[PDB]
């Protein structure tokens, strides 16, 4: 309540820098997220825990508003320059969002769908889409298995969209 | 019948004014070249012989913009303002 | 008295802005559905001078 | 049931009620996407529960 | 356009007046982009003035 215009200005600059990058590199957002989690008290007190919960739900909100391209990038060039920014994202899902932004040993419908949409977008924009999809979803068994465990619960949602 | 149609027309004119400023121009044409329907419409434009709240608002600014356009012969504006001032059981 | 006009929802235009960016990157010759919809609404209106 | 109790409790007791569920299944009632929008567009940010 | 011409005129007279311009240079007062953002977020989409 005050801000829905400024969030649109953010969407503007986001899409601008997306196209500037399409002109491999990792996004500054995840850096800012890491800096604020670091600059919070590492103490385990309910005050700090609730402050961290608030900050992560707001992070989830900002990424759901902004495009699904900031997660997976766009147009995966080759198999050599692969898993750039997705490891950045997986580190965040394992370190933090698994603590607070979860339920039942699984993730949120919203962010699961946001990710999978971004994934299919960049993969289908790139060549060998089935093979490269299979590659990154095999990586997920090692780096962030929450995504798979989330996508089992939220499958009746995604399957129509993805099909 | 041209009274109710005219109220729908002035509603539309005002909400175009809102989405814009500077006087929806359909109406300014109708003013000089449809003077009969201009006065059948301009009765609804001054159908606020009603509480004018403290702050200027849609209707207020709409009519201010018209009287700046040198329309509203001051007769009907004076009228507007005056009307505005306002056992068996 | 109709006294100007109310808004309702600047949220839902943001919820559109999302789906727009999405489908757009999904495509990237063919033509958009928006201009089609616009033509349909302009056609469904009255053609008069009133 | 017609309890003159709190509204929150009342609403949720009505939800849980089976016969209301049986009624939602006959689909003149199921709240389309379009009917959903036509309400959500009604409301303002000005005063809001959420 | 907006409420009383004298309030408007007062603002413009202050804005044009020299000693305001000479004060605005040496500045903690010069409205940092972050301070701008804090005020723009403070205000609502409800009662706008714009």
Number of H helices, E strands in chain E: 3, 0
Q: How many Å apart are CA A95 and CA A9, to the nearest integer?
A: 30
Q: How many Å apart are CA B25 and CA B33, to the nearest integer?
A: 12
Q: Which of the 8 DSSP states describes residue D29?
A: S
Q: How many Å apart are CA E26 and CA E20, to the nearest integer?
A: 11
Contacts of D45 in chain C (CB under 8 A): 7, 9-11
Q: Which two tokens stand for residue C39?
A: 């033509």
Q: Measure the CA dihedral A44/A48/A50/A56, to 10°.
A: -100
Name the residue among B7, B15, B48 with its Cβ closest to that of C5. B15
Contact B6, B40 (CB under 8 A): yes
Q: Which two tokens stand for residue A11?
A: 């969407």
| Residue C12 to residue D43, Cβ atoms within 8 A | no
Contacts of B71 (CB under 8 A, 6+ apart): B31, B42
* Interior/surface letters E11-36, b for 16+ CB within 10 angstroms, e for the rest: eeeeeeeeeeeeeeeeeeeeeeeeee
Q: How many Å apart are CA A120 and CA D15, to the nearest integer?
A: 38
Contact A101, A111 (CB under 8 A): yes
DSSP per-residue codes, chain A: ---HHHHHHHHHHHHHHHHHHH-----HHHHHHHHHHHHS-----HHHHHHHHHHHHHHHHHHHHS-THHHH-S----SSS-SSSHHHHHHHIIIIITTSS-SSSS--HHHHHHHHHHHHHHHHHSSSHHHHHHHHHHHHHHH-THHHHHHHHTHHHHHHHH-
Residue of B2, B18, B46 for testing the chain C interface, max C β-carbons within 10 Å: B18
Instruction: Determine the distance in angstroms separating the CA of E11 from the nearest CA of chain B, rounded to an integer.
Output: 19
Contacts of D10 (CB under 8 A, 6+ apart): D3
E12 at interface of A, judged by CB pairs closer than 8 A: no
Q: How many Å apart are CA A67 and CA A117, to the nearest integer?
A: 10
Distances (CA, A) of A3 to A11, A94, D24, D26, E43: 13, 30, 38, 41, 8
Strand residues in chain B grouped as ranges (E): none
Instruction: Determine the distance in angstroms separating the CA of C2 from the nearest CA of chain B, rounded to an integer.
Output: 6
Instruction: Quote the Cα angle for D40-D43-D45, to 5°.
Output: 115
Contacts of A56 (CB under 8 A, 6+ apart): A96, A97, A99, A100, A101
Q: How many Å apart are CA B60 and CA B77, to the nearest integer?
A: 12
Name the residue among E37, E40, E44 with its Cβ closest to that of A1. E44
Q: Of A156, A138, A133, which is closest to residue A148 (Cα–Cα)?
A: A138
Q: How many Å apart are CA C45 and CA A59, to the nearest integer?
A: 44
* Interior/surface letters A134-152, b for 16+ CB within 10 angstroms, e for the rest: eebeebbeebbebbebbbe
Please name the residue of chain B whose CA is at the shortest distance from the CA of residue E49: B57
């Amino acid at each position: 309540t005050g801000n829905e215009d400024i969030i649109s200005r953010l969407q503007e600059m986001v899409a601008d820098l997306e196209l500037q990058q399409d002109l491999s590199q990792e996004h500054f957002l995840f850096e800012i997220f890491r800096r604020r989690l670091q600059a919070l008290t590492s103490g385990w007190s309910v005050a700090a825990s609730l402050q961290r919960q608030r900050e992560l739900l707001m992070y989830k909100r900002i990424l759901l508003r902004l495009p699904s391209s900031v997660l997976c990038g766009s147009s995966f060039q080759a198999e050599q320059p692969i898993t750039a920014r997705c490891e950045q994202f997986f580190h965040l899902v394992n370190s933090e969002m698994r603590n607070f932004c979860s339920h039942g040993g699984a993730l949120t419908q919203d962010i699961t769908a946001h990710f999978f949409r971004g994934l299919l977008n960049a993969c289908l924009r790139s060549r060998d889409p089935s093979l490269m999809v299979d590659f990154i979803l095999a990586k997920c068994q090692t780096k962030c298995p929450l995504i798979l465990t989330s996508a089992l619960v939220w499958w009746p949602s995604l399957e129509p969209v993805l099909l | 019948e041209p009274h109710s149609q005219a109220l729908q027309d002035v509603e539309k004119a005002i909400m175009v004014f809102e989405h814009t400023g500077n006087i929806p121009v359909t109406v300014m044409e109708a003013s000089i070249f449809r003077r009969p329907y201009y006065v059948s419409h301009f009765l609804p434009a001054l159908l606020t012989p009603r509480v004018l709240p403290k702050v200027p608002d849609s209707r207020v600014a709409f009519i201010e913009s018209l009287k700046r356009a040198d329309k509203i012969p001051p007769s009907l504006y004076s009228t507007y303002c005056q009307a505005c001032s306002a056992e068996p059981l | 008295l109709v006294f100007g006009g109310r808004t309702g929802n600047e949220d839902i235009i943001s919820r559109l802005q999302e789906m727009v960016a999405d489908l757009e990157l999904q495509q990237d010759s063919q033509e958009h559905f928006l201009f089609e919809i616009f033509r349909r609404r302009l056609q469904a209106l009255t053609s008069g001078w009133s | 049931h017609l309890p003159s109790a709190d509204w929150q409790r009342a609403a949720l007791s009505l939800w849980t009620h089976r016969t209301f569920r049986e009624v939602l299944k006959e689909e003149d009632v199921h709240l389309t996407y379009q009917d959903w929008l036509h309400l959500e567009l009604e409301i303002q940010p000005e005063a809001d529960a959420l």
